[PDB]
Amino acid sequence: MESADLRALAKHLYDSYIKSFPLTKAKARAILTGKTTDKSPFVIYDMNSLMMGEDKIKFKHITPKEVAIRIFQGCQFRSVEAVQEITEYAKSIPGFVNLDLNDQVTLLKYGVHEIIYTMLASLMNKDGVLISEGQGFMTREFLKSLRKPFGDFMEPKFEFAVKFNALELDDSDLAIFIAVIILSGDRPGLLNVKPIEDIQDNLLQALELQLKLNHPESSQLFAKLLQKMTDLRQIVTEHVQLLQVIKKTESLHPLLQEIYK
């Protein structure tokens, strides 16, 4: 591909990424660092501040239980929203809607988890995570200190995010990276791998040029970012095993179960 076509693809994905997702990394960083002019987020650091944050912020999430469960269900509620946002974004990826419909379903099914982890890092620092489009901030130490298996379920997300954020990618970088994850030709059950790798080869070309122009000083950043797809594959399988352990230990309305299946 000619470089001007790669740049056009990079911008097409950036513009769609801005429309699809509620809180960009650029805004998230201004909040976390405290450089923004907007109001300080509500901070949840323990039981009583969580209670006020629900009565203050309008948590649609569960808020119909026990605190560790309620938080867990808040992460699931937001993840369900993120899947729809990613599904919408994927449609803007040139070539995606022309794929066999079953393959589109399969690529989203196996990709959304890796993309959620990746984009969750945009909302985290070493001390906590933004919530509710940035109106709130809940501390890492509070999440890490939840009882039984919940504390150990939260912390791996921060340990990854802290590592991923040291690459210092911005939104224009992430927009292409996310597209590369979706167009993975090795997902189980794909019917027609060739046009998926064909598209990914083009996204990879655009990612490489984007990182060289946007980060001329960061050597082999392309490779370092692809190496992070190893971090992603491993933590997602670990994650699946942690949910399976939770289910066998911790009922919900059958309709709710369907929603979260």
Ligand X SMILES: O=C(O)c1ccc(-c2nn(C(=O)c3c(Cl)cccc3C(F)(F)F)c3ccc(Cl)cc23)c(OCc2cccc(OC(F)(F)F)c2)c1
Does 182 engage in binding with ligand X (CB under 6 A)?
A: no
- Cα end-to-end distance, the chain, whole Å: 41
| CB nearer to ligand X: pick between 6 and 146 | 146
Which one of the spans 114-122, 162-170, 181-189, 192-200 is the region binding ligand X (CB under 6 A)?
Answer: 114-122
Question: Which residue shows structure tokens 């890492």?
Answer: 140
260 assigned binding-site residue: yes
Residue sitting closest to ligand X (CB): 74
Q: Which does 36 bind (CB under 5 to 8 A by kind): ligand X, a second copy, none?
A: none
> Is 214 near a second copy (CB under 8 A)?
no
185 contacts: CB under 8 Å, gap ≥ 6: 193, 196, 197, 200
Q: Does 221 bind ligand X (CB under 6 A)?
A: no
Closest CA to 247 of 167, 153, 112, 171: 153
- The one among 61, 68, 106, 206 contacting ligand X by CB under 6 A: 61
Residue 23 makes CB contacts below 8 A (sequence gap 6+) with 122, 123, 130, 133, 134
Phi, psi of 42 (to 5 degrees): -70, 135
CB count within 10 Å of CB 237 equals 11
State the binding string over 71-100 for ligand X (x if CB under 6 A, else -): x--xxx-xx--x------------------
Measured distance CA(181)–CA(36) in Å, rounded = 31
**Contact flag: residue 234 with a second copy (CB under 8 A):** yes
* Position among 57, 229, 235, 242 found at the interface with a second copy (CB under 8 A): 229
CB of 24 to ligand X, least distance (A): 11
Q: What DSSP letter does each residue of 196-217 carry, written as one string?
A: HHHHHHHHHHHHHHHHHHH-TT
Phi, psi values for residue 210, rounded to 5°: -60, -50
Footprint on this chain of a second copy (rule: CB under 8 A): 186, 200-201, 204-205, 208, 219-220, 222-223, 226-227, 229-231, 233-234, 237
Annotated binding-site members for rosiglitazone: 76-79, 113, 239, 260
Footprint on this chain of ligand X (rule: CB under 6 A): 59, 61, 71, 74-76, 78-79, 82, 113, 116-117, 119-120, 123, 129, 131-132, 138, 143, 154, 157, 243, 256
